Design a protein around this motif. Sequence first.
Motif, PDB file in Angstrom:
ATOM      1  N   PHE A   1       0.869  -1.141   0.000  1.00 55.13           N
ATOM      2  CA  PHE A   1       0.000   0.000   0.000  1.00 55.13           C
ATOM      3  C   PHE A   1       0.890   1.168   0.000  1.00 55.13           C
ATOM      4  N   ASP A   2       0.324   2.345  -0.292  1.00 49.18           N
ATOM      5  CA  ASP A   2       1.004   3.598  -0.399  1.00 49.18           C
ATOM      6  C   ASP A   2       1.218   4.134   0.965  1.00 49.18           C
ATOM      7  N   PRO A   3       2.043   5.204   1.194  1.00 48.96           N
ATOM      8  CA  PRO A   3       2.338   5.583   2.541  1.00 48.96           C
ATOM      9  C   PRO A   3       1.346   6.548   2.921  1.00 48.96           C
ATOM     10  N   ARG A   4       0.931   7.288   1.909  1.00 48.65           N
ATOM     11  CA  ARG A   4       0.071   8.420   1.954  1.00 48.65           C
ATOM     12  C   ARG A   4      -1.341   8.005   2.168  1.00 48.65           C
ATOM     13  N   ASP A   5      -1.689   6.823   1.658  1.00 45.48           N
ATOM     14  CA  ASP A   5      -3.095   6.289   1.518  1.00 45.48           C
ATOM     15  C   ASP A   5      -3.192   4.851   1.909  1.00 45.48           C
ATOM     16  N   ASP A   6      -4.403   4.354   2.036  1.00 47.49           N
ATOM     17  CA  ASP A   6      -4.782   2.998   2.535  1.00 47.49           C
ATOM     18  C   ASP A   6      -5.517   2.067   1.611  1.00 47.49           C
ATOM     19  N   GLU A   7      -5.500   2.378   0.284  1.00 45.09           N
ATOM     20  CA  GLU A   7      -6.109   1.463  -0.758  1.00 45.09           C
ATOM     21  C   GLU A   7      -5.109   0.428  -1.211  1.00 45.09           C
ATOM     22  N   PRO A   8      -5.456  -0.846  -1.284  1.00 46.51           N
ATOM     23  CA  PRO A   8      -4.531  -1.973  -1.506  1.00 46.51           C
ATOM     24  C   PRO A   8      -4.092  -1.899  -2.993  1.00 46.51           C
ATOM     25  N   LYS A   9      -2.808  -2.166  -3.347  1.00 45.84           N
ATOM     26  CA  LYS A   9      -2.158  -2.098  -4.635  1.00 45.84           C
ATOM     27  C   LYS A   9      -1.379  -3.322  -4.941  1.00 45.84           C
ATOM     28  N   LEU A  10      -1.520  -3.876  -6.186  1.00 44.89           N
ATOM     29  CA  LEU A  10      -0.919  -5.143  -6.520  1.00 44.89           C
ATOM     30  C   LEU A  10      -0.392  -4.857  -7.846  1.00 44.89           C
ATOM     31  N   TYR A  11       0.891  -5.249  -8.110  1.00 43.57           N
ATOM     32  CA  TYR A  11       1.533  -5.047  -9.372  1.00 43.57           C
ATOM     33  C   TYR A  11       2.225  -6.296  -9.825  1.00 43.57           C
ATOM     34  N   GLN A  12       2.600  -6.392 -11.071  1.00 43.95           N
ATOM     35  CA  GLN A  12       3.320  -7.444 -11.613  1.00 43.95           C
ATOM     36  C   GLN A  12       4.399  -6.818 -12.421  1.00 43.95           C
ATOM     37  N   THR A  13       5.563  -7.509 -12.485  1.00 50.65           N
ATOM     38  CA  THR A  13       6.554  -7.272 -13.526  1.00 50.65           C
ATOM     39  C   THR A  13       6.689  -8.625 -14.178  1.00 50.65           C
ATOM     40  N   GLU A  14       7.170  -8.660 -15.461  1.00 50.67           N
ATOM     41  CA  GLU A  14       7.371  -9.792 -16.283  1.00 50.67           C
ATOM     42  C   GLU A  14       8.725  -9.658 -16.862  1.00 50.67           C
ATOM     43  N   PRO A  15       9.310 -10.711 -17.547  1.00 49.20           N
ATOM     44  CA  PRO A  15      10.591 -10.575 -18.076  1.00 49.20           C
ATOM     45  C   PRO A  15      10.761  -9.499 -19.013  1.00 49.20           C
ATOM     46  N   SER A  16       9.741  -9.164 -19.745  1.00 49.92           N
ATOM     47  CA  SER A  16       9.830  -8.367 -20.884  1.00 49.92           C
ATOM     48  C   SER A  16      10.193  -6.929 -20.561  1.00 49.92           C
ATOM     49  N   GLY A  17       9.556  -6.422 -19.432  1.00 50.06           N
ATOM     50  CA  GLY A  17       9.870  -5.096 -19.009  1.00 50.06           C
ATOM     51  C   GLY A  17       8.564  -4.377 -19.132  1.00 50.06           C
ATOM     52  N   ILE A  18       7.390  -5.114 -19.058  1.00 53.66           N
ATOM     53  CA  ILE A  18       6.062  -4.608 -19.207  1.00 53.66           C
ATOM     54  C   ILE A  18       5.523  -4.903 -17.845  1.00 53.66           C
ATOM     55  N   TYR A  19       4.770  -3.937 -17.346  1.00 56.30           N
ATOM     56  CA  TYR A  19       4.166  -4.080 -15.993  1.00 56.30           C
ATOM     57  C   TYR A  19       2.713  -3.781 -16.069  1.00 56.30           C
ATOM     58  N   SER A  20       1.957  -4.379 -15.187  1.00 60.28           N
ATOM     59  CA  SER A  20       0.511  -4.332 -15.140  1.00 60.28           C
ATOM     60  C   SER A  20       0.033  -4.253 -13.728  1.00 60.28           C
ATOM     61  N   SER A  21      -1.284  -3.930 -13.554  1.00 59.09           N
ATOM     62  CA  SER A  21      -1.929  -4.099 -12.275  1.00 59.09           C
ATOM     63  C   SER A  21      -3.031  -5.153 -12.525  1.00 59.09           C
ATOM     64  N   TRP A  22      -3.220  -6.024 -11.535  1.00 58.86           N
ATOM     65  CA  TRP A  22      -4.275  -7.025 -11.574  1.00 58.86           C
ATOM     66  C   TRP A  22      -4.906  -6.969 -10.244  1.00 58.86           C
ATOM     67  N   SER A  23      -6.164  -7.434 -10.149  1.00 59.20           N
ATOM     68  CA  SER A  23      -6.896  -7.629  -8.905  1.00 59.20           C
ATOM     69  C   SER A  23      -6.404  -8.844  -8.242  1.00 59.20           C
ATOM     70  N   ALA A  24      -6.237  -9.915  -8.962  1.00 56.27           N
ATOM     71  CA  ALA A  24      -5.626 -11.018  -8.330  1.00 56.27           C
ATOM     72  C   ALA A  24      -4.954 -11.659  -9.526  1.00 56.27           C
ATOM     73  N   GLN A  25      -3.776 -12.314  -9.260  1.00 58.51           N
ATOM     74  CA  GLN A  25      -2.982 -12.800 -10.327  1.00 58.51           C
ATOM     75  C   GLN A  25      -2.120 -13.897  -9.819  1.00 58.51           C
ATOM     76  N   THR A  26      -1.825 -14.845 -10.709  1.00 61.12           N
ATOM     77  CA  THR A  26      -1.053 -16.012 -10.286  1.00 61.12           C
ATOM     78  C   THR A  26       0.138 -16.192 -11.252  1.00 61.12           C
ATOM     79  N   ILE A  27       1.341 -16.694 -10.889  1.00 69.83           N
ATOM     80  CA  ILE A  27       2.411 -16.943 -11.772  1.00 69.83           C
ATOM     81  C   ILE A  27       3.157 -18.133 -11.149  1.00 69.83           C
TER      82      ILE A  27
END
Lengths: 232, 242, 244, 98, 204, 50, 244, 241, 246, 238
Positions: J136-162
């Motif tokens: 979560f952010d320091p400033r705020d309390d909303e939950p944040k989830l990110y992904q990185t992949e090999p490629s160098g492309i990043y996304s946000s997902w609600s829930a994600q599996t790898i």
Amino acid sequence: RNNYDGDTVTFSPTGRLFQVEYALEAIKQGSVTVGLRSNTHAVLVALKRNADELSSYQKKIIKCDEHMGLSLAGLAPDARVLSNYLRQQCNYSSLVFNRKLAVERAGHLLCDKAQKNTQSYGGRPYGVGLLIIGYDKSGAHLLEFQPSGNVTELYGTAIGARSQGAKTYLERTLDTFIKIDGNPDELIKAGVEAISQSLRDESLTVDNLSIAIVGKDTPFTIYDGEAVAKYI
Amino acid sequence: AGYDRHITIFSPEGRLYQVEYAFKATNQTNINSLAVRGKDCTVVISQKKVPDKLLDPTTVSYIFCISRTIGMVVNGPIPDARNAALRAKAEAAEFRYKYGYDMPCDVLAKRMANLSQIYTQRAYMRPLGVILTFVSVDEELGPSIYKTDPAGYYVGYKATATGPKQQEITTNLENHFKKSKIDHINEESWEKVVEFAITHMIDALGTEFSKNDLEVGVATKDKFFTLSAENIEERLVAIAEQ
Amino acid sequence: EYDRGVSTFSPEGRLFQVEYSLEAIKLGSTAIGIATKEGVVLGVEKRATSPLLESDSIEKIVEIDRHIGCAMSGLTADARSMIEHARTAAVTHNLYYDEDINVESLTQSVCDLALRFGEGASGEERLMSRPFGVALLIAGHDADDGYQLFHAEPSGTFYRYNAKAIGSGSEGAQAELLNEWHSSLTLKEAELLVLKILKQVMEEKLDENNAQLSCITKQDGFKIYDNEKTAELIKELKEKEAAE
Amino acid sequence: PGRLDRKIEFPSLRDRRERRLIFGTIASKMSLAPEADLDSLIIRNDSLSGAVIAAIMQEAGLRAVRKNRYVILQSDLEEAYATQVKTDNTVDKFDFYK
Amino acid sequence: SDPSSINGGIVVAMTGKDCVAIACDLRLGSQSLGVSNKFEKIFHYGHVFLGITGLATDVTTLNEMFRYKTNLYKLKEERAIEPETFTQLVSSSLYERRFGPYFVGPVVAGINSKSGKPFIAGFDLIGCIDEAKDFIVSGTASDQLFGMCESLYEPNLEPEDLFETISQALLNAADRDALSGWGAVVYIIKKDEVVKRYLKMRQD
Amino acid sequence: ADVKGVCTEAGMYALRERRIHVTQEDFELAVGKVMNKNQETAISVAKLFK
Amino acid sequence: GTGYDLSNSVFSPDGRNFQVEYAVKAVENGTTSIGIKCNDGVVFAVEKLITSKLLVPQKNVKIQVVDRHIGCVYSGLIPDGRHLVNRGREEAASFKKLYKTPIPIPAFADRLGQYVQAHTLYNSVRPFGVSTIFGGVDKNGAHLYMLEPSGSYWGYKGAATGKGRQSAKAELEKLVDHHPEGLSAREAVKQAAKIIYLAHEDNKEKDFELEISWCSLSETNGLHKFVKGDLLQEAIDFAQKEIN
Amino acid sequence: RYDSRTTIFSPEGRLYQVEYALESISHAGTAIGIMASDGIVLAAERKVTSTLLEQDTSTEKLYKLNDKIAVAVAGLTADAEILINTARIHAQNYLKTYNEDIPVEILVRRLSDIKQGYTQHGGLRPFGVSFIYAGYDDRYGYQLYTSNPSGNYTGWKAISVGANTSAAQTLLQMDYKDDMKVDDAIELALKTLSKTTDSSALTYDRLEFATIRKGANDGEVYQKIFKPQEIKDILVKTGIT
Amino acid sequence: YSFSLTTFSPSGKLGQIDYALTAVKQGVTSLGIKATNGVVIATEKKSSSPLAMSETLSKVSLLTPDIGAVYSGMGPDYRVLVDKSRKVAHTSYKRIYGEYPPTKLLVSEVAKIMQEATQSGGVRPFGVSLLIAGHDEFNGFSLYQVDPSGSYFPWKATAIGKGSVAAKTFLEKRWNDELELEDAIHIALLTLKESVEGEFNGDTIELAIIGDENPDLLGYTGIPTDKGPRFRKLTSQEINDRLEAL
Amino acid sequence: GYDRALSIFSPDGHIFQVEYALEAVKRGTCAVGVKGKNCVVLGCERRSTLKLQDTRITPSKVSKIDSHVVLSFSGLNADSRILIEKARVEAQSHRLTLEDPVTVEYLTRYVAGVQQRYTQSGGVRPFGVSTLIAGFDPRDDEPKLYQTEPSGIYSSWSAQTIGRNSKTVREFLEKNYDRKEPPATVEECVKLTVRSLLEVVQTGAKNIEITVVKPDSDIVALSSEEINQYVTQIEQEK
């Protein structure tokens, strides 16, 4: 064979570099441009291409400086480097000697730039040919640039797609435009005639013609659009 | 099958095919050299083969003045001949001002030889095809001949020969030293030691020589000079006359 | 050979390796931009490979200034570097002249980084080792030329356009733009036009999670829309075609 | 097996012992002279084979009949050895792996 | 004060017959402020002892630096460094930075396990071997020590007589040294073992 | 395959010897030859050097 | 054969570097360049082919000057020969600063031969493919060399290279026969022209332009200059007279 | 095919060069650590030997990297040599900066990066070294790890690297005891080393040994490398000789 | 596989290392025998022509006065690497330690120069395996073999080069646990005469020792407290002496 | 095809080295992320190779980069190890500059950044590691989830599996999950994670590892006992 491409650093058995000749090819596949001159002006007229009819053409004359300018024929990323290099030299001449760059000294600097890629592993000889005009202190000049790096002074030449038709026009009418001096319109008109002939399966449009001019009392000026519509 | 298209990559016998094809590039100008020791001189006499008549003969040479007391004779090709000659000169210069004395025949030949090893160690240069033989009379070793090879192998010598017909030169020399039972020529001025080198070379090859067809460099005590064609000529009728 | 080089020419005079990079640009999602005399409207398609993909926290329309926006397709990886460089150029211009950057001029800077392919070639010191698999639609407004749309091609240089499509659906989209465009358009018309063409070249359903408009209107600045705004225009569209 | 069990190799690199022996035995069937040294042709080249020893002697008497001579001199022996000396790189006289 | 020895400290090394001793005061000073009563000058690596006098920051820095240098040796050869060899190691560390140089006066003390022979050495700022085996003193009381030591020095005292001789030299000197006066630790070093004995003395 | 060839070599040494009996000295030479030869396929004591 | 080209440092089994031999073959396709050394000078003449009759005449030279006294003419590729002369001007200039005198001709011969040799010694450059005839006048009199693309040089009484080396070496071979004495530089101007005229029957498809240059101790004050005007016309009349 | 340089992957997401580097390991002798709460034994076997190979004057498969962490080596000894120097230099760097003898974890993690680094960057060769790290740090007590040439680590209660990894591992886990003794740990290493190794008699000279203990006098940490004669005696006790 | 320094093999190892090993085997035969007060090191010389000076070949080169060497493998590689070895020995271990380095330590530096010439692809490692014998006041007389694989091993008696395999069993048989230097010098010549015959003589076999301190070679006197060179090169005349009493 | 090298493009427009990099991710342990409304739970499979493997000192598959951002990985373990350390130097450095703790949005860019850089170049291979960055952010309390992949492309997902059979968990997730209402209680959200991880272990309750990030620099690693109770609830109902 043809395993003596694949390297620009290997001479073939025949003593050519295939890589520099293949650079000569890339030119033909891009647009045509015509150079010609008199003794009071040098004029360039160039066929501009578009890719579709929402596209608004592509500029193929770059102003180098106010007493120099060039056209391009072949690859457009290769063109950008050389027109930038050429400008460094013209600015240098103004800053260090307060002197207009001479076309002939320009050309041999361009020659050098090219031979730098030719010797080196890595890199390519540039994929573009330029037709360079200027008017300096020794009057008008016109050079023909190649990938090998050879600059050659000529009263009139053409490079690019189906350029034999323009060179044929030029040959026949060589002496007519040399003798005309003092009338800027006539050299402009003559170049128009040449590039019409170059074309096959096309007709001239007000946005095909690009006119570029330098003289005794003519600053560098790039005409397009409704400025080439007096002389369509 | 891999293994002369690379400098550094060995064969499955542990040989470097490419490096050895340089020992085999020393035939490309097709000249022979002989250098022998006297008792107050070191002589080197190599062919000067001026092939064409469009050439001016007095710029054709293989003997290079390296330094005040140091000459070098080249067998093998001209382009690499010149590279060998500048480096040995450059080093001659460096040694004198850094270490404050003249450069002996060993010190130079060892340094070039190590240099050849470096050029074979990397795959970023090639070996040269030239054989270098340094000639001098050394400051405390006297007459010295050091042959520096293209790999960087060196061995000293009483006498050495180089070139296509080197084998024919080699038997004549061997028989001389065997019979004499000394590692020197006992002729006590260099003008007759020079004559002796001419003498053996005529017999080996079977050819007469003339003024244009020889080159002679002479290392004498504390000085060095390469002989003109008319001084070589004096030597050549000295042979003929006995 | 010619294509497994990187500065090796083919016998037709094409740098094949560089040719191949154009098909990278296409793999990505369709974006269709249409310039108008009121502003430029930039739309995208954003793929959802899962309902679980947050398609609305990812974007491919990005802010570059306060009157320069960019659409992109290809590697978002290479879009990160291409967009980052371009942002730097806008800001450093702003530093140097305290004046708006022209649309075209931002494009010259994006094409300079593109030039670089090499490892021996001269012009500028080559440090970047391959072509960029990513294109831009560059939108802005200077006041001395008006609203403009330019297309950056990493394998070429800057082309002026009244409309371009890039992405997978580019080829068929382009026909429709040859068919329906006008100089008689308002931005209101222009917005329902991006959407009308977009859907036909879409294989995903036309909804707000897979869409997203923004505009360069000089007055309003660079403005990314709502999901609530984009959903409205889908309805207005549906009303229009029933009538029609 | 049942057919060949012995696979008796025949080499072309050989050694200094067996070059020396093949030469003296060929030089026991034809003339010689006191100047004619045979034990100095097994060291200069080193990858010579048995057929080529039958080339070298034949060619020795072809220099000898050019002069018109009944014996084989060291001049004859050397000239004829330089023809068909072989170009092989499997030799040792050009080595530095010692 | 002087820029190379504002923070003081004194070290004194002597030779006895098949024994060395070394001793130091424990006062750290910073100008005129006495800072800590416990703070040793002498450090050791294996069976070689070293005191390092001088500007206090560089004593601490070379303590660490020498430990890094000694231990690289020990592990690699599988055996202790000797106090003959160790001399020339100080000499090179000090000379590496001749320009902007360490401000110390280190004094070695130690006894070989291959001769059974006492070895003492001194070094300056950019280092020197001062290979006297008379007695070697360094510190701010350098002047004071050279005389006090000389007076007492008889060569070839028995170890326990040597403890009397160096402790006495040190104590008189310290009272009359401005930048040291507190505490003392005396090392009596032998082949077999090394006995460390703190004095009891006056504070200023 | 080694151990049937040891026996072949020993019996050929024993032929030179010219005895009904095959002595054990022939089986000392057969091992010393089969063994030496397989250390030349390993290019010296290369296991040591790796 | 096959193999050991494709590299420019790889030895052949014969003992050679193939690619370096292929250099000489390119020099052969280049136009004819000769130098005739004379007893108080040197004369350089060159056959400059006419691409088309649209060429400006006497404004394009394969003659270039080095320092203020050393003539150079190259045969082979026109721009390669240029590139090699520029390096030469910088080297002659460094010599000149350093010692406060103009170069010896033997000095230049050494220096040039090291720069050609440097590109045969390394794997990332293509060796040169030009010969360059050069020379001039110094203290020690007149001297003439011809530097091969292999990096080989010697002095010459007279030197020829290019397509016309077959004719030119033969004419020069008569020249030494008729004059072993030296031949004055003036009479060699008229000679220079005839030699080219007969060497132009190896490039007969195209037309040519004759340019003569010289450098002479007593008729040019040690300095190199183009031969033009009346001297140049007389040589034309000489060559025209005897060819018919 | 994909058996080339390191940038390239195989389409199965295998870098062949890490896989081969693993296989390098089992062409140099067996090396075993067995962890016990009384101490760790490190035991190793010689890759080959002759009757005039001197191996009683020095070790060369047991190196001290510092005064509390030591390593057994299995694999190419040339590749090993550079990595041991880099480890040891770092071990003292930690000493200089913090005044504590380097933690076992920080040292393994450093070297895991370094191995990884030679595969990942440039044209440089990967390393084909397995080091059994046996240490003490006052955080986790006694610690065993081993690092792959791949450039990652796992903690163990027993591990075997070097030749005959599978069998040597099996016999170890078969007779392993959770608390163990230091003395039993030494015995289980000879028992396994006998059956895995194709030397006829198991000689003191085919063994190197070191033990790291805090139970041989507390207050202090004692690294005891066994000399030839100590090794020679303990074979007797276990009745192999 | 075999055929880059960069490529690992399916069973592992670099092949360039194996091929460099092959080079050594084409070499000349050098051998060392450790006695209880020395190490004798011996090799032969060849040069093809007999017109060659044999006293100009370097193959017995002192690195330091305490430590001699020989090689088998490439001749050129030797001179360069002896040169480099010396240079490193003073920088790391004579400016620091204050005296010429330990036999163990110096052998490790030599291996480290090799190792750098394996890591950098396109750069072959040295053609030579050296034998480096020396003395120090801690580990005594010592003998090593340092391979072009960049690893070194300590040894009691060893031989390397072409004739290695024949020499090693002679060494097994004839070595005893207690020998003198003089019985080692004779065993050394005897074994080396297996390598060649028809050319073996006291002026063409080069043999040296690293034996006892000799103040005769020290060249300055009136300093008892230091030792003199351990190294001694025996002249041609000495080598003939020993060959007659054998 | 054009896997002979990284810099050369491909008729097919897919750089092969990146595609194979993905393939490598499937080697490593499964990791799953599920966001709540007041929680993110970041769980990972902790696959046990042998019974001699310590739990004393052996690394967890989940690594805290900073004190409120959490990171799991799937891939080449060797490669992950330097990727996590590089992530961390920057992360801390973020405070050096701003005197603000690390924002999750700045952090995903950075991790994608080191990776993008490696791909762009030719004289390095890409990282064979896809990561999930939760926080979560320091400033705020909303939950944040990110992904990185090999490629160098990043996304946000609600829930994600790898990693390790990612597909089968992904589908499982869709069906269970609701985007209208993500679970707003930390416990129920944990339970969803456990159910996922159950599948890939087949059998284990000592091989499922759960970690949780909560707002305001709360990061906790769950007891092995505590996870077994959740497994107990899931086995009974089934």
